[PDB]
C-alpha cells in the first residue's frame, strides 16, 4: 500500500485517496511527501455501522480534517430520509470548517439522491465502462439532468445574434450538446441588424446563459459588454 501510495505521489497525481482506516505511520508518511497533490481523506461504511444524525461520523471527520485537503465520507441509505440527514450533516460541517470541502454520499439505490445533491466532486459512472465503481452510482449526465429536474440547474436562454441567420446550424449544435450533456438550457434565433436596446434586455436578463454573435454585430456588440 505504502509503495503504491508513493507511486501515485511520484507520478504527480492531482488527487490521492488514502483511507482513514490506514495505520498512522502510513498516514504520516504519505502526508509528509504529498507535495502539491491534494489528499482526499476517505472513509466508507458498507456494513452501515455509522449514522449521519447521531454524529457517529465525527471521529472520522475530525481525523480526515487534519490529514485531508478534501474529506470523503460514504455511508449507506436504507430509506430516503437517510439522504436528508446526510445533506444536513454536510451543511453543518461546511459551516464549521469552510476551508475543507467534502464529498458525502450514500450507497445503494436508496441513496441515489445523495449523489445528485452532493455537488462537489461527486464520483460518477459512464455507460461505456464495463462496470460501475460502486453500485447505483449515476453518470455525470444523469446527475446533471437529475439536478435539472429539481431546478438546482436552472434553465437558461442562449441566443444567436445577427442576420441572416435563418440557415445557421448553431441552434442545432448547442441544443444537441445541451441534451447530450444533460443540461436543461435552450438555444434560439434572434435576427437583428443592430445591437438594440431590445437586444440588451435579453442579454441582461437573469435567464441569459450566453450567446453567439455573428455578422454584422461582432464589433458593434462590445460596448454593451462589461469586459
Amino acid at each position: 500500500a505504502l509503495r503504491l501510495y508513493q507511486t501515485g505521489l511520484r507520478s504527480g497525481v492531482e488527487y490521492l485517496d488514502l483511507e482513514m482506516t490506514m495505520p498512522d505511520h502510513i498516514l504520516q508518511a504519505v502526508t509528509d511527501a504529498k507535495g502539491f497533490t491534494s489528499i482526499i481523506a476517505s472513509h466508507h461504511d458498507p456494513q452501515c455501522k455509522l449514522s449521519w444524525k447521531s454524529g457517529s461520523w465525527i471521529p472520522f471527520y475530525n481525523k480526515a480534517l487534519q490529514y485531508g485537503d478534501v474529506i470523503k465520507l460514504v455511508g449507506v441509505a436504507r430509506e430516503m430520509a437517510d439522504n436528508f440527514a446526510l445533506t444536513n450533516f454536510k451543511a453543518k460541517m461546511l459551516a464549521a470548517h469552510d476551508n475543507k470541502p467534502m464529498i458525502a454520499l450514500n450507497m445503494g439505490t436508496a441513496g441515489k439522491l445523495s449523489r445528485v445533491l452532493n455537488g462537489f466532486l461527486t464520483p460518477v459512472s459512464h455507460p461505456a465502462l464495463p462496470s460501475k465503481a460502486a453500485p447505483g452510482q449515476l453518470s455525470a449526465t444523469e446527475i446533471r439532468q437529475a439536478l435539472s429536474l429539481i431546478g438546482e440547474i436552472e434553465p437558461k436562454s442562449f441566443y444567436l445574434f445577427g442576420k441572416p441567420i435563418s440557415a445557421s446550424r448553431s441552434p442545432a449544435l448547442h441544443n444537441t450538446l445541451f441534451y447530450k450533456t444533460g443540461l436543461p438550457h435552450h438555444y434560439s434565433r434572434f435576427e437583428t441588424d443592430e445591437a438594440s436596446k431590445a437586444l440588451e434586455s435579453l442579454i441582461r436578463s437573469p435567464d441569459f446563459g450566453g450567446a453567439s454573435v455573428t455578422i454584422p454585430l461582432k464589433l458593434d456588440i462590445m460596448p454593451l459588454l462589461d469586459s
Binding site: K53, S54, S56, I58, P59, N62, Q66, H97, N99, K100
Partner: protein
C-alpha cells in the same frame, strides 16, 4: 483504603480501586432498588467495560429486575438535543418507568448528557455517576450540573440534578489515552489555582513525573501508572473534596460556585468555536491564561502569579494560547474573532444581564472575590485582541513610581552567588525566569542550598551551604536555559564526589545544539574532566565532581 467524601449532607462519593466490577453492582441493587437499571456509555467504552458489568450485575440481581444497555457516539457532539431524544426514545421503547435507575458510565460528556436525561425523564429519575476520565473524577461527576450544547454555545440548556451516588474507580485511568489525561489536568490545575497554593506547588513538582509515567510504554497499563499511584490518589481525593465542599455551600451557583468557572468565561467562548476538535480542558487552559492576564491588567493579580500559572499549564503540555500549533492542526486553522468570542461570552451563565462576570485571581490560591466579578467589555476585548488602540493622553502633572521586572543578568547571578555563600539572603525583585527556576531545582538536588519563598513568591529566601555540594546521580534537566547551563557547568564542578565521581547536565532538543565549547576548553585546561555525551561543543555534558577548579592561571 476506600475513602468516601461528603456532599450535600451525605457521603455519596466513594473513591476506591476496582469497584466497577464488584462493589458498584451490589450497592446499586441494595441502596437504589428498582425494577429497571439503564447503563449508558459511549462506543469507545462499551465492549471493554459493559459486558463484564452485565455478567456481575445479572448474577446478583433478583428475578424481576433488568439491566438495559446503550452506547452513544463519543465526544462533544453528543451533548446535543438529538442524542438526548435518541436516548429517551430508546428508553421509552423498553417501557422504562419512573423507578428506573440510570448509570452514567464515562467522562463528562456522558455525565452531562445522561445526567440531563435523568433530570428530565418523567420529570426526573435517579441516576449515578461512574467517571472514567481524570476530568470527570475530579470535576464533571460531582456537583450535579447537567447540560447540552446548542449551536449558540456551551452548556446553555441543562439542569441541576444530583446523582444519588458517585463511584470513582481510579482503575479507569489505566486505559485512558494520554491526551485525555492532560485534558483533565486543566481542571485539576484550575481547582488548585483558586483554592490551594500548596497543592499548586505539588502539581509543579509532579508535572515531570506524571507525564513521563503516562507516556510510558511499560509491560501493562496498570504498571504504567504505578509510580504515580500516590500522586493520582492525592489529586483525585483533594480535587473532589474542594468541589464537594464548594457545591455543598452553593449548589445552585448563587455566588461561591462561580469560582469553579475559572478560565471558563473565556474558555467556553473559545470552545464554542473550536469544539469538537479541540477538547474542553484544552480550552480551559487557554482561558485560564487569558482570565489571569485580564486580572493582571485590572491590577488585581501580580504578574509573577500569571507567569507561574502559565508555566504550570505549559509544563503539563497544555496550550497557553489559542495560536498553539496543535490547535491550528486539529482545527484546520479555525479562526476565533474577538467579536465572535464576545458574542459567546454574552450568554455566559454567570452574567448579570449585559454585565459579563469573570473569576479574577488575586494570587495563586486566592480569588479577588468569593464569586465572579463584573468586568467591562473594553478590558475583555483588549485581552482577546491581537492589536492595541492607544488613546493619547496622560493625566496633567502625573508623578509615578514604576518598577519593571528584574534584570535577568543581575537576577541569575544573584541566585548563584547567594547559593554558594555562607549565611542567609533575602532577594527582592528577582526575575523568576526559566534560568532561575531550573538552576534553583538543580542546586536543590545538589544539596547546595535551602530555598524558600516569602510575600507570595516575591522574595526568595536563600540559605547557602558555603560551597559544599554533592554530585547528583540523576542528570539535571535544564530545558533551553542558556545562562543556566553556562553558570551550572562551572558550579557543578565544585561539588565533592558523593554517589558518583561525576555529574551530568542535559536539557531540551534546542539545548543540545547550543554552543558551550569555549567554556569546556577552560575547564579542561584548569584540571576539570568533562566529556560530551552526544554532540561535540554542546550539551549534554558530563562534568567531573572535583573540589573546584585547580586554580592559578586560567
Amino acid at each position: 483504603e476506600p475513602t468516601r467524601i461528603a456532599i450535600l449532607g451525605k457521603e455519596d462519593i466513594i473513591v476506591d480501586h476496582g469497584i466497577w466490577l464488584n462493589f458498584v453492582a451490589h450497592d446499586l441493587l441494595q441502596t437504589l432498588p428498582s425494577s429497571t437499571y439503564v447503563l449508558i456509555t459511549d462506543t469507545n467504552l462499551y465492549t471493554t467495560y459493559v459486558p463484564p458489568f452485565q455478567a456481575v450485575f445479572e448474577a446478583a440481581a433478583p428475578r424481576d429486575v433488568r439491566l438495559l444497555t446503550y452506547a452513544i457516539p463519543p465526544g462533544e457532539y453528543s451533548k446535543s438535543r438529538e442524542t438526548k431524544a435518541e436516548i429517551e426514545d430508546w428508553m421509552l421503547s423498553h417501557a422504562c418507568t419512573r423507578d428506573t435507575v440510570i448509570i452514567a458510565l464515562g467522562g463528562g460528556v456522558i455525565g452531562d448528557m445522561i445526567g440531563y436525561v435523568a433530570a428530565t425523564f418523567m420529570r426526573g429519575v435517579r441516576f449515578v455517576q461512574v467517571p472514567t476520565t481524570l476530568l470527570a473524577m475530579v470535576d464533571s461527576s460531582i456537583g450535579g450540573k447537567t447540560a447540552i450544547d446548542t449551536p449558540m454555545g456551551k452548556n446553555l440548556i441543562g439542569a441541576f440534578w444530583q446523582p444519588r451516588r458517585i463511584y470513582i474507580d481510579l482503575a479507569f485511568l489505566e486505559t485512558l489515552p494520554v491526551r485525555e489525561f492532560i485534558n483533565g489536568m486543566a481542571e485539576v490545575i484550575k481547582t488548585a489555582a483558586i483554592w490551594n497554593e500548596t497543592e499548586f506547588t505539588a502539581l509543579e513538582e509532579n508535572a515531570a513525573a506524571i507525564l513521563e509515567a503516562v507516556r510510558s510504554k511499560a509491560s501493562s497499563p496498570a504498571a504504567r501508572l504505578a509510580p504515580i499511584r500516590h500522586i493520582l490518589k492525592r489529586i483525585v481525593l483533594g480535587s473532589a473534596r474542594v468541589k464537594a465542599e464548594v457545591v455543598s455551600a452553593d449548589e445552585r451557583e448563587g455566588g461561591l460556585r462561580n469560582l469553579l468557572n475559572f478560565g471558563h468565561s473565556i474558555g467556553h467562548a473559545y470552545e464554542a468555536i473550536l469544539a469538537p476538535q479541540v477538547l474542553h480542558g484544552e480550552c480551559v487552559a487557554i482561558g485560564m491564561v487569558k482570565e489571569a492576564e485580564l486580572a493582571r491588567y485590572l491590577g488585581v493579580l501580580r504578574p509573577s502569579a500569571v507567569a507561574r500559572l502559565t508555566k504550570l499549564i505549559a509544563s503539563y503540555d497544555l496550550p497557553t494560547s489559542v495560536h498553539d500549533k496543535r490547535i491550528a492542526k486539529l482545527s484546520a486553522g479555525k479562526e476565533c474573532p474577538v467579536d465572535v468570542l464576545l458574542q459567546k461570552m454574552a450568554v455566559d451563565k454567570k452574567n448579570e444581564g449585559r454585565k459579563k462576570k469573570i473569576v479574577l485571581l488575586s494570587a495563586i490560591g486566592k480569588t479577588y472575590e468569593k464569586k465572579a466579578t463584573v468586568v467591562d467589555d473594553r478590558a475583555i476585548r483588549l485581552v482577546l485582541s491581537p492589536s492595541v488602540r492607544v488613546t493619547p493622553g496622560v493625566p496633567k502633572g502625573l508623578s509615578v513610581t514604576v518598577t519593571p521586572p528584574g534584570s535577568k543578568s543581575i537576577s541569575n547571578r544573584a541566585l548563584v552567588l547567594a547559593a554558594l555563600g555562607e549565611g542567609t539572603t533575602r532577594i527582592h525583585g528577582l526575575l523568576h525566569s526559566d534560568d532561575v527556576q531550573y538552576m534553583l531545582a538543580a542546586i536543590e538536588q545538589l544539596h547546595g542550598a535551602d530555598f524558600s519563598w516569602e510575600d507570595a513568591g516575591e522574595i526568595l529566601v536563600v540559605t547557602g551551604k558555603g560551597g559544599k555540594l554533592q554530585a547528583s546521580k540523576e542528570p539535571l534537566y535544564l530545558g533551553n536555559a542558556g545562562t543556566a547551563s553556562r553558570f551550572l557547568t562551572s558550579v557543578v564542578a565544585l561539588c565533592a564526589p558523593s554517589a558518583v565521581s561525576s555529574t551530568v547536565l542535559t536539557g531540551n532538543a534546542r539545548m543540545k545544539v547550543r554552543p558551550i565549547g569555549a567554556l569546556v576548553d577552560a575547564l579542561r585546561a584548569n584540571g576539570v574532566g568533562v566529556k560530551y555525551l552526544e554532540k561535540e561543543k554542546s550539551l549534554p555534558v558530563e562534568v567531573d565532581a572535583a573540589g573546584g577548579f585547580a586554580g592559578g592561571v586560567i
